[PDB]
Amino acid sequence: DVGTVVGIDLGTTYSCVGVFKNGRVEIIANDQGNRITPSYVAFTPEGERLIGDAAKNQLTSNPENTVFDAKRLIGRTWNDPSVQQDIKFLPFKVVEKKTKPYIQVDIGGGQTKTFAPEEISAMVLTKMKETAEAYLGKKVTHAVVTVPAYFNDAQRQATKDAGTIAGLNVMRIINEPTAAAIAYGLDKREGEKNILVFDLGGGTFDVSLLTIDNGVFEVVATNGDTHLGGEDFDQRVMEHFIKLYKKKTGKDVRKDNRAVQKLRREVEKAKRALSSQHQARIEIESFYEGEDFSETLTRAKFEELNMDLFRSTMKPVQKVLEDSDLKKSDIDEIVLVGGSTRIPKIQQLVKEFFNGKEPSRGINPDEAVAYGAAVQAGVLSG
Ligand SMILES: Nc1ncnc2c1ccn2[C@@H]1O[C@H](COP(=O)(O)OP(=O)(O)O)[C@@H](O)[C@H]1O
Ligand SMILES: [Mg+2]
């Protein structure tokens, strides 16, 4: 008895969970009221493990004892060149254990813990499970979980293993861009179609060319950038305010990690607000040296600060087209996935790339992966 099967987007930076209930997909909000959850772990001084928003939001002078971006390590060996490059940018200790890159952190009271990447991902899955369980008012045992299309055998297996640690039977692993297409019902169409999935998220950018024929998807080609996303757009805005504050006050605020953390949280909030309004205020009491911070950001200025990075997203799209032996006019469907596709300028540049073709619309782009997983989970629940 598989009970109510859940659909989980286990994301690099943000995860999402949904279920099929009363004839439709329901995307479930977590205990902080958010329909997405950061793939983030941290610890209190008392040694309590925090997961999700609470972990990401905890102010700290010790980023080395937070864990995030475990998806960059999952299913890879310690000596994988990708791992050896990624660890340069991660503030937490990564150590070789049993051929793998385990994560070593201090959790409180001088206690040290070492975790496999799948154990970290299992923590996030546990949080997504608890989210679903609170919504349904009962336990969940089975899930459909998504992975990037480029995930290999070990990465898929390690994701299943993370499920298992979390007490979830991962019944099916499905590809992210495929799940997005399913969310839009592109699998329920007749004939042979080419689908371009443009997935611009928090830390990663993935472009996928799918073909759909007779209900079966084929991933023809993939491309993107493993270190481009909304975090990068945030940092351009951070740089801008950090420089302006120095120019006003003579002080550089990077000396204080808590100040940088506060500013990053408000900047990300303003960025989001600027996808639906033209100006946002950034305010922080006791920002730095007991002085308050109060500045505004316009949509135009946000765009100007990131325009080169926005425009860089088209190059991977042109590459997947060349690799698929396709031209722009061969694309029958454009699917926008990922939170950063809420940015009006991104929408605009994708549409202009495709000479005025409108993309699929109606599902929140940061939810579309979980949505698709949930559609399949509905069928499996019966
Ligand atoms: N309304 C908005 N306007 C602009 N960007 C938005 C939003 C809402 C979320 N975001 C940005 O989306 C990024 C996370 O994307 P995601 O697909 O949820 O995460 P992931 O699957 O980990 O790449 C994050 O960088 C998050 O800040
Ligand atoms: Mg994603």
mmCIF file of all heavy atoms in Angstrom, residues 357-373:
data_model
loop_
_atom_site.group_PDB
_atom_site.id
_atom_site.type_symbol
_atom_site.label_atom_id
_atom_site.label_comp_id
_atom_site.label_asym_id
_atom_site.label_seq_id
_atom_site.Cartn_x
_atom_site.Cartn_y
_atom_site.Cartn_z
ATOM 1 N N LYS A 357 7.809 34.150 -30.166
ATOM 2 C CA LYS A 357 7.017 32.990 -29.691
ATOM 3 C C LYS A 357 6.787 33.012 -28.187
ATOM 4 O O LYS A 357 7.741 33.115 -27.418
ATOM 5 C CB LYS A 357 7.695 31.669 -30.075
ATOM 6 C CG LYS A 357 6.923 30.419 -29.679
ATOM 7 C CD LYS A 357 7.446 29.196 -30.418
ATOM 8 C CE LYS A 357 6.939 27.889 -29.840
ATOM 9 N NZ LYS A 357 5.459 27.805 -29.791
ATOM 10 N N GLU A 358 5.531 32.878 -27.758
ATOM 11 C CA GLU A 358 5.221 32.880 -26.319
ATOM 12 C C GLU A 358 5.523 31.524 -25.724
ATOM 13 O O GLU A 358 5.292 30.509 -26.343
ATOM 14 C CB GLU A 358 3.755 33.226 -26.039
ATOM 15 C CG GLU A 358 3.367 34.675 -26.357
ATOM 16 C CD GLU A 358 3.497 35.639 -25.170
ATOM 17 O OE1 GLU A 358 4.405 35.480 -24.305
ATOM 18 O OE2 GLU A 358 2.675 36.584 -25.112
ATOM 19 N N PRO A 359 6.042 31.506 -24.503
ATOM 20 C CA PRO A 359 6.270 30.251 -23.827
ATOM 21 C C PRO A 359 5.004 29.678 -23.195
ATOM 22 O O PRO A 359 3.993 30.359 -23.146
ATOM 23 C CB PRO A 359 7.273 30.634 -22.755
ATOM 24 C CG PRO A 359 6.909 32.036 -22.422
ATOM 25 C CD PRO A 359 6.610 32.646 -23.761
ATOM 26 N N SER A 360 5.062 28.425 -22.725
ATOM 27 C CA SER A 360 3.983 27.874 -21.887
ATOM 28 C C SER A 360 3.785 28.770 -20.629
ATOM 29 O O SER A 360 4.736 29.365 -20.139
ATOM 30 C CB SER A 360 4.305 26.428 -21.477
ATOM 31 O OG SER A 360 4.132 25.516 -22.558
ATOM 32 N N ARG A 361 2.552 28.880 -20.120
ATOM 33 C CA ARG A 361 2.261 29.781 -18.995
ATOM 34 C C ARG A 361 1.203 29.169 -18.114
ATOM 35 O O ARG A 361 0.341 28.455 -18.605
ATOM 36 C CB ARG A 361 1.723 31.132 -19.491
ATOM 37 C CG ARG A 361 2.679 31.920 -20.369
ATOM 38 C CD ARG A 361 2.356 33.413 -20.392
ATOM 39 N NE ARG A 361 3.495 34.181 -20.904
ATOM 40 C CZ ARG A 361 3.730 35.473 -20.664
ATOM 41 N NH1 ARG A 361 2.908 36.202 -19.907
ATOM 42 N NH2 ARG A 361 4.810 36.044 -21.186
ATOM 43 N N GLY A 362 1.253 29.460 -16.814
ATOM 44 C CA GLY A 362 0.179 29.055 -15.922
ATOM 45 C C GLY A 362 0.643 28.270 -14.719
ATOM 46 O O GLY A 362 -0.124 28.065 -13.768
ATOM 47 N N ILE A 363 1.879 27.811 -14.748
ATOM 48 C CA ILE A 363 2.430 27.137 -13.583
ATOM 49 C C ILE A 363 3.610 27.941 -13.083
ATOM 50 O O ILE A 363 4.444 28.340 -13.870
ATOM 51 C CB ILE A 363 2.804 25.687 -13.908
ATOM 52 C CG1 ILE A 363 1.524 24.931 -14.323
ATOM 53 C CG2 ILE A 363 3.474 25.029 -12.704
ATOM 54 C CD1 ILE A 363 1.724 23.458 -14.556
ATOM 55 N N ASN A 364 3.677 28.176 -11.769
ATOM 56 C CA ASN A 364 4.811 28.895 -11.191
ATOM 57 C C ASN A 364 6.099 28.141 -11.558
ATOM 58 O O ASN A 364 6.188 26.944 -11.351
ATOM 59 C CB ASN A 364 4.665 29.037 -9.677
ATOM 60 C CG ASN A 364 3.537 29.972 -9.272
ATOM 61 O OD1 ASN A 364 3.300 31.009 -9.897
ATOM 62 N ND2 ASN A 364 2.849 29.617 -8.203
ATOM 63 N N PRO A 365 7.081 28.832 -12.160
ATOM 64 C CA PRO A 365 8.257 28.148 -12.704
ATOM 65 C C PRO A 365 9.125 27.427 -11.675
ATOM 66 O O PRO A 365 9.721 26.387 -12.004
ATOM 67 C CB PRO A 365 9.034 29.278 -13.427
ATOM 68 C CG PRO A 365 8.513 30.534 -12.860
ATOM 69 C CD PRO A 365 7.087 30.275 -12.465
ATOM 70 N N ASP A 366 9.144 27.916 -10.435
ATOM 71 C CA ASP A 366 9.884 27.243 -9.359
ATOM 72 C C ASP A 366 9.113 26.051 -8.775
ATOM 73 O O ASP A 366 9.635 25.356 -7.925
ATOM 74 C CB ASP A 366 10.331 28.201 -8.263
ATOM 75 C CG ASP A 366 9.240 29.143 -7.778
ATOM 76 O OD1 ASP A 366 8.083 29.042 -8.235
ATOM 77 O OD2 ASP A 366 9.569 30.039 -6.956
ATOM 78 N N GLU A 367 7.877 25.858 -9.224
ATOM 79 C CA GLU A 367 7.026 24.756 -8.803
ATOM 80 C C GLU A 367 6.828 23.685 -9.870
ATOM 81 O O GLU A 367 6.415 22.571 -9.546
ATOM 82 C CB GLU A 367 5.673 25.281 -8.356
ATOM 83 C CG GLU A 367 5.797 26.343 -7.292
ATOM 84 C CD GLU A 367 4.489 26.927 -6.850
ATOM 85 O OE1 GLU A 367 3.430 26.583 -7.416
ATOM 86 O OE2 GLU A 367 4.504 27.732 -5.894
ATOM 87 N N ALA A 368 7.137 24.011 -11.122
ATOM 88 C CA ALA A 368 6.773 23.158 -12.266
ATOM 89 C C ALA A 368 7.403 21.761 -12.228
ATOM 90 O O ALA A 368 6.785 20.801 -12.651
ATOM 91 C CB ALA A 368 7.107 23.854 -13.579
ATOM 92 N N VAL A 369 8.600 21.637 -11.668
ATOM 93 C CA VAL A 369 9.236 20.338 -11.545
ATOM 94 C C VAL A 369 8.480 19.459 -10.557
ATOM 95 O O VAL A 369 8.116 18.337 -10.894
ATOM 96 C CB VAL A 369 10.699 20.450 -11.143
ATOM 97 C CG1 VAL A 369 11.289 19.069 -10.894
ATOM 98 C CG2 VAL A 369 11.465 21.148 -12.255
ATOM 99 N N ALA A 370 8.233 19.972 -9.360
ATOM 100 C CA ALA A 370 7.440 19.243 -8.366
ATOM 101 C C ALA A 370 6.045 18.943 -8.884
ATOM 102 O O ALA A 370 5.513 17.874 -8.613
ATOM 103 C CB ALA A 370 7.340 20.028 -7.071
ATOM 104 N N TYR A 371 5.451 19.908 -9.587
ATOM 105 C CA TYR A 371 4.112 19.746 -10.183
ATOM 106 C C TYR A 371 4.028 18.490 -11.054
ATOM 107 O O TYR A 371 3.149 17.644 -10.859
ATOM 108 C CB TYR A 371 3.744 20.998 -10.998
ATOM 109 C CG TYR A 371 2.254 21.180 -11.322
ATOM 110 C CD1 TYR A 371 1.529 22.254 -10.786
ATOM 111 C CD2 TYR A 371 1.589 20.326 -12.219
ATOM 112 C CE1 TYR A 371 0.187 22.446 -11.090
ATOM 113 C CE2 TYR A 371 0.259 20.530 -12.544
ATOM 114 C CZ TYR A 371 -0.441 21.582 -11.973
ATOM 115 O OH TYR A 371 -1.766 21.757 -12.284
ATOM 116 N N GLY A 372 4.955 18.382 -12.006
ATOM 117 C CA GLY A 372 5.083 17.191 -12.856
ATOM 118 C C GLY A 372 5.293 15.904 -12.080
ATOM 119 O O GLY A 372 4.713 14.863 -12.395
ATOM 120 N N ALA A 373 6.140 15.955 -11.063
ATOM 121 C CA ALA A 373 6.355 14.772 -10.233
ATOM 122 C C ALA A 373 5.057 14.342 -9.550
ATOM 123 O O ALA A 373 4.740 13.140 -9.453
ATOM 124 C CB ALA A 373 7.463 15.030 -9.232
#
